[PDB]
């Protein structure tokens, strides 16, 4: 019998950890800002637990602005760990963010708070919109997988960490008044890199295996991706990303710190209601000539074609009347067809009119507005595909619009709940590797603790750092060295504007690399093994 | 010294996982609907990570209806894994649900959202109450305990998975108008089973140990349970379940997607307030003749026996008066005794009357209503034990009632916070195995990560799949082969209606089985070992 | 190749766990109440999983009162496990609470609920403020680290557990009317200790290593701490604690069950708004003569120096006027200097006046009030250092104040979000061990899953119970046997009252002890090893 109450403890190798912080050297001469950190310590033999610290300057001026959640991660486009001009490990910002999303405390470190993420307003050039702050991004690496066992070994080697940054506008949500360009021009990229170094006595570095994510982004509205030179893949991930370019980054609302689906929908609905119901003495003016504003009858029921909206507003003054905007946002690709009308999404609206503020305090609104509706950019509403005018809102409501350029969005909606992929076929060489008609791989990714809300084919179930990893292996004789992924778009109503939001297919292939310390630090891509 | 920075990695077994999905064959000829899946793959040698996918059809018609949270799990009554008419592993739906409750992402896969769980209303026969949806239940098995190590081994064996389903009404909350019977009659039981198969090179299966939960449900209001043929029990669980039969499934309110105790209480209080305070020109009509409605005095204080209720309603029209229902729900088993009165649970009620909607917008209510009050079925309020009429609500408020048949409720309230067990004695053979006067075992179950909110006696603390499990073992010579559990009901006020809610005692015994692969797949109950 | 699908299971040592509950003996003769538990079982050979159960009596009388969250842990000042007048393991209450804070189920066991933590009011001497309750504190010990492997071995030894308690007022939040002293006098300290004992056959105890937290609290507003006799330290933690002795325990608001930063700020803002905006026929009376109350102009804009507050109140009666309190709370250390004015934190206030309740229902308030403002004690506002009166509130608003003595507060605000430490230098002997200019150690503590919100230097990354722990080791020849920690206060505005909240520096050093069972149970501090 093996005892489970007593063990003969082993003495571990003698070591002493130490926290080490290094200053970054900013290079702005290229298209993307880069910050370079040199590992200048020569008394340490191992290292892991990389942390990036970012100093956010105080923001002053006029306009409305908030930060996107998890500022520190959203600022990162690419991280590369190099040893004398040779890459040891590298990842995209999105893969890092996905790998860190599970840890709540760590993600909170990156900046997620009412002060940072709720919309703040400046009304004078000296008004402070956002106070200065420090945020931190935990750069999860395979070197942290098994604590000291997985650490990156250093043997008189110059290890360099290079971080490539997204534009500062990517981590910002702001209105038209806010001067985002000036702040981007004057942003000080003051950052520090921290890590745990280990002074280890009598360390003999053995070869190790690490996984490096290879990311392929297809052209806009392309549904096929080919990954070449695939020899040892531990997991394959497929998902779609929105393309929010100019005029497709403009949104009617943004919930700020409250990030649930209901919060997005409620912010969108509040913005819509601000412009849908009007209390005025005469016919409301200022709307586009295509807007169809009708007076609410004494019964309170307004009929829009064959759907009824029940409007009941309290405390309307004697002279005033209640009006309803019946086509506040419309979309269709052909004339005389069915029209996507945001006003028709409402069944009942109730509220009380306030004399002091000359506005309506809405108390209850029964509606069918969903996350997809709240995620449609203004440019899609007003695109050339629309046969109608599209945006019938007043100039003030349009002036309340916000610009969003969050770099790590997935799917077509902000919460990645509407799946635009119906079928997925994966081919290794000539043969079919996997085929599914539904999101089975997404469910399996959820169950196995992989990247949330994406389709993932997991090939490695072997424990790390004590076994070599199991991977989908190439067979060059049969030509099995390339992965081809084909996806079919999920069916949507042709009048739904969400169909026409541009999208890009992303394929992520995690590949096995062999880490050797015989002569410096060298990472070799595993082939035929 | 043993190194903690470098290890000599081992090459693992050569294997390749694959996601496999199979179609279900529905059998409706018996009392309980069954869906059978055949594992038709002969290339694979091992398998685990079972997932059940359920297609929910679009719901159309009139009435109000929502889904209960975690639809996919609530649909499951029983799961059995068989190999040529012999059971390998089987569980009840409730045990599966309890075993999966810890993983938030997995539970969200089963259907837990605003769209699914909040009450939706149809007003025309063609109105869509609920859109079609797909939900997934992760069938956690002992085969997933240690990833590939615990996988079920296949050796040219026909493994079949049979899922027995609860009635569709069990996963639905609806009013009297909704035609639940018609939808149950026409429910398409389209389901798929998914699992991860493993193509393993040179696999030699070895005997393994798995735990199978044996579930015993005692007769209604029985407090003693005897489990026979107990030879290797790893854990014993005891809890009470409500018996929500016909007319005991009718409830005044249901919170829907918001599932906290405060949400249940708030929904119940809103429903009560809608009928307790009345603004009317004359004495309110339509209530039963036993209802005691009194006018609110100018001081705003209404005295109910020796209890005062402070009612202040703003914006009451000049000619109208405010009325308070003082016995909206009452219960007592004896005349002239103390009466349980829901109206007396309120100390202060404030609100504003709305002319547009002809109703009251309540702003603040100070009350002592608890989860137990919100969990009392209408049938208990109106049962023959009540010496009073019981339900004094108006016909409309009664028409707002909802039918709930959630299969996995524990205790006597929806949130399982009121413990109805005071003492518990467990006897193994003639001798006392464990006796407690408080919920010590429930606290230990919480600490050890066992089923939440139940009393659990844990016998196995040994790591799985690398040691044989430790269990409470039988001694036939002394007669130690049967477990007898006796519980005493916690003291409650005799006028509390919650005391008379029918309940059933449940005892769950997790027993050790030996899995052998010498001749097919055979699971043998561990006896006298 | 090593198999990952099949293993040769080992038979574990024969054991049987059992839940054991013992009654506590209360000693009130000393300054701090102590409860002693005797481990009276001679059959068992091992133990772990200690749980303390506390019976809370029913609370009756007049006044307002709520419990602090996690009552059971906050009641504990110190726990000591002894074997014949020799300490085996001991911890402070704060360290235990910090070590348990990550387990939400376990913390919920300790009394975190709406019934316990929201403010309750008694209006008669017979009114029940709080019903009786039972709460449980899981006494996490190193004996639970690796289940049976780490258990405390018993060999015919008399093990006693002594729990030292904080004053009952520490776990309560109450107003001036509540008679806390009488209830503290009459509190029955009814407590039970539960643990899991193991009946182990043929157990030979082996020496084991455990870590004991050594806690040092410096004098008030001291920034240097010296820890002597440091020979094997696995982790060092540094943080600041507020000192709320008397009149510094009085606070304007407390949010109760809702414990987010936003909840604290919202409760504070509601309390302030109740006194800032007054609707009255004549000039408001009852305020101190230093209060500056001004009438709101028809434009609604009130100018406070160079700050403008937009006040718009609906439904004001014809004869009444709206007033704004322009200095509700003020603080400054010098005359003519910048004044910290809480009224200046508000930019816009909107609401509707209620004739039924003669009060304002505030609907929207735009403000810059933060957690630090909500955490300033009333005594700091009215301290002698303030050159102004400080508290200009009305007597009723002042009568709504609450007394808080939560023992486990960190930082200077209730949520420990404002860091009062700028620099930290740690010296081991004469040399600098670690030096940081920012909260790098706090970030690493968050990443490594250490005590939340504190600066932690981690020295042990070695797995527990299978290796001897790695620690910062002493070198007596070089004088390396003492840790000196120096911190510099973070810069704050001189007019900010939060600067003058008294604080105490806490240093926690986790030290290695050797547990030997050769002759009884003896824990020996690891010295020079």
UniProtKB/TrEMBL annotation, chains A, B, C:
Keywords: Membrane. The keyword Cell membrane does not apply. InterPro entries: Poxvirus_Rif-R. GO terms for cellular component: membrane. Its main location: membrane. It comes from the Viruses. It is a peripheral membrane protein. The keyword Membrane applies. GO terms for biological process: response to antibiotic. It is found in: Membrane. This is 62 kDa protein. The lineage of its organism: Viruses, Varidnaviria, Bamfordvirae, Nucleocytoviricota, Pokkesviricetes.
């Amino acid at each position: 019998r093996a005892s489970v109450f007593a063990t003969d403890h082993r003495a571990p190798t003698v070591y002493m950890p130490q926290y080490i912080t290094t200053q970054g050297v900013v290079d702005t001469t290229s298209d993307a800002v880069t910050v370079t950190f040199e590992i200048r310590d020569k008394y340490i033999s191992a290292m892991n637990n990389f942390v990036l610290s970012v100093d956010l300057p105080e923001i002053k001026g006029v306009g409305k602005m908030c930060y996107v959640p998890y500022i520190a991660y959203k600022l990162i486009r690419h991280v590369a760990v190099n040893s004398a001009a040779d890459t040891i490990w590298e990842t995209s910002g999105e893969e890092l963010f996905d790998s860190c999303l599970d840890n709540e405390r760590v993600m909170e470190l990156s900046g997620f708070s009412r002060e940072l993420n709720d919309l703040s307003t400046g009304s004078s050039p000296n008004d402070v919109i956002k106070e200065a702050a420090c945020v931190h991004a935990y750069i999860k690496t395979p070197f942290d997988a098994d604590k000291t066992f997985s650490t990156l070994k250093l043997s008189d080697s110059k290890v360099t960490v290079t971080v490539t940054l997204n534009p500062v506008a990517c981590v910002m949500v702001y209105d038209e008044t806010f001067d985002a360009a000036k702040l981007a021009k004057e942003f000080p990229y003051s950052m520090e890199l921290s890590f745990i170094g280990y002074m280890v006595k009598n360390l003999c570095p053995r070869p190790a295996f690490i996984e490096m994510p290879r990311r392929r982004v297809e052209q806009i509205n392309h549904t096929t991706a080919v990954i070449t030179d695939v020899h040892a893949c531990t997991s394959l991930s497929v998902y779609m990303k929105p393309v929010l370019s100019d005029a497709n980054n403009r949104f009617i609302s943004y919930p700020g710190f409250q990030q649930s689906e209901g919060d997005f929908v409620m912010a969108f609905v509040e913005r819509l209601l601000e412009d849908m119901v009007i209390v005025s003495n005469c016919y409301p003016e200022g709307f586009p000539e295509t807007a169809e504003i009708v007076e609410v009858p004494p019964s309170g029921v307004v009929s829009i074609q064959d759907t009824d909206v029940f409007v009941r507003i309290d405390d309307v003054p004697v002279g005033m009347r209640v009006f309803l905007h019946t086509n506040i946002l419309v979309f269709a690709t052909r004339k005389n067809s069915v029209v996507y009308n945001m006003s028709k999404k409402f069944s009942a609206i109730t509220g009380a009119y306030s004399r002091a503020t000359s506005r309506i305090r809405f108390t209850t609104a029964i509606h069918s507005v969903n996350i997809g509706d709240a995620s449609v950019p203004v440019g899609v509403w007003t695109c050339q595909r629309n046969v109608y005018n599209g945006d019938n809102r007043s100039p003030e409501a349009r002036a309340k619009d916000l610009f969003v350029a969050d770099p790590f969005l997935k799917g077509v909606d902000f919460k990645n709940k509407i799946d635009v992929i119906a079928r997925m076929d994966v081919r290794f060489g000539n043969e079919v590797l996997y085929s599914e008609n539904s999101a089975v791989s997404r469910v399996f990714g959820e169950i196995l603790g992989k990247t949330p809300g994406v389709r993932t084919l997991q090939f490695n179930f072997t424990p790390s750092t004590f076994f070599s990893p199991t991977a989908l292996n190439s067979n060059v004789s049969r030509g099995k060295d390339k992965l081809a992924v084909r996806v079919t778009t999920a069916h949507m109503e042709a009048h739904n504007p969400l169909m026409y939001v541009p999208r890009q297919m992303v394929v992520v292939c995690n590949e096995v690399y062999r880490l050797s310390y015989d002569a410096g630090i060298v990472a070799e891509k595993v082939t035929a093994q």
